[PDB]
Design a protein around this ligand. Structure first.
Ligand code: ATP
Ligand code: CA
Ligand code: CA
Ligand code: CA
Lengths: 352, 22
């Protein structure tokens, strides 16, 4: 009896077996019906994302994603495997119940559990108190956590994440005459972003370096032989995280949302939050982002405050890894919701 | 308590290095 961990994101499903060090299955959270990699290759049906900004919004398509996960990706019988799922911070109660109902009634799992994504990322770093910045394809959150409890008044949601950065790179690539328009082309630009982009330690100074020579330029070649060369676009793209005005958003940037979130917590915990800033999710992978965040938070915090940013190399899968850890601890085993409990009490048991 | 045992296990889990290599 081996537990499964399924971490459902706006852009990517990460799934696998509890006890493994990484998800074996990672695929696009897309329904075209076709699911995942199948759907993109056969773009031609239309593509829908059943999770928007971290929240499940299309339950029929979400069910196809879970089915594809169990049967085609992991090749398991779900009725034999306790299953740990993940949810966004502030996921409405109704959504949690419906996830529980689908798992027990449609997939017949013997047991299940739903954990908050940011909390899992904190656990993966060995911590039970800290503040997580979780930034994926569709949403970014700041989640302060006290001994495993996400502090609900201090959680911040920011609708600025990887897909917005990809779209912004598509826009600014036109300055050099390049044209990427198609959804297929968006996938190309996504990969360019991932390969060439970085966070400047100081933006204004980096802009000056980029204007004064070509030393910051890098190139990416498409299969047809087109060479895409960019300079300041490399760091302007993720700068958006720190300056959302780049894409017409009024919001504060991620450094400030981190600070604001800490400031909505009791003063007596702020020290431990400042010293345990954990970075999670694919959009935190930009080289230089940890050092920039350290600098920005330092500029916002009390002058004597010890500031520490933890950015693990595995952080594209930290949520998933935290679930894998949690689900295989002997001390967690009594916390599964069992099919017997669901059978007697129904969906609302999940809030227990 | 229940939670202190889980919390302690999380602190001493050793992270991904103690999980199975895929
Ligand atoms: N090396 C990288 N550099 C920049 N961005 C990256 C890198 N690797 C992955 N990403 C981005 O991370 C995103 C996917 O991350 P992740 O799987 O954490 O998000 P998700 O869980 O699908 O979405 P969300 O948490 O917003 O619901 C994509 O936008 C992807 O382009
Ligand atoms: Ca996610
Ligand atoms: Ca206090
Ligand atoms: Ca090992």
């Amino acid at each position: 009896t081996t537990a499964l961990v399924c971490d459902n994101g706006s852009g990517l499903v990460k799934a696998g077996f509890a006890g493994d060090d990484a998800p074996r299955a990672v695929f696009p959270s897309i329904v075209g019906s076709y699911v995942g990699d199948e759907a993109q290759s056969k773009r031609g049906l239309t593509l829908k994302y059943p999770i928007e900004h971290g929240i499940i919004t299309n339950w029929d398509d979400m069910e196809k994603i879970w089915h594809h996960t169990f049967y085609n990706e992991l090749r398991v019988a779900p009725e034999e495997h306790p299953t740990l799922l993940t949810e966004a911070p502030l996921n409405p109660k109704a959504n949690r119940e419906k996830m529980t109902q689908i798992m027990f009634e449609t997939f017949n799992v013997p047991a299940m559990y739903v954990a908050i994504q940011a909390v899992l990322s904190l656990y993966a770093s060995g911590r039970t108190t800290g503040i997580v910045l979780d930034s994926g394809d569709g949403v970014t959150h700041n989640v302060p956590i006290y001994e495993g409890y996400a502090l609900p008044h201090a959680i911040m949601r920011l609708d600025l994440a990887g897909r917005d950065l990809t779209d912004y790179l598509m826009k600014i690539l036109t300055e050099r005459g390049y044209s990427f328009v198609t959804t297929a082309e968006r996938e190309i630009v996504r990969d360019i972003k991932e390969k060439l982009c970085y966070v400047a330690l100081d933006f204004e100074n980096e802009m000056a370096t980029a204007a004064s020579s070509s030393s910051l330029e890098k190139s990416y070649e498409l299969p047809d032989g087109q060479v895409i060369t960019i300079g300041n676009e490399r760091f302007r793209c993720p700068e958006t995280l720190f300056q959302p005005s780049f894409i017409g958003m009024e919001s504060a940037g991620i450094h400030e949302t981190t600070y604001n979130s800490i400031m909505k917590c009791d003063i007596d915990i702020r020290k431990d939050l400042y010293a345990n800033n954990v970075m999670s999710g694919g959009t935190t992978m930009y080289p230089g982002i940890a050092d920039r965040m350290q600098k920005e938070i330092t500029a916002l915090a009390p002058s004597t405050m010890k500031i520490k940013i933890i950015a693990p190399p595995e952080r594209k899968y930290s949520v998933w890894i935290g679930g894998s850890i949690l689900a295989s601890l002997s001390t967690f085993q009594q916390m599964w919701i069992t099919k017997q409990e669901y059978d007697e009490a129904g969906p609302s048991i999940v809030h227990r | 308590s229940l939670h202190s045992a889980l919390l302690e296990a999380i602190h001493s889990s050793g992270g991904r290095e103690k999980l199975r290599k895929v």
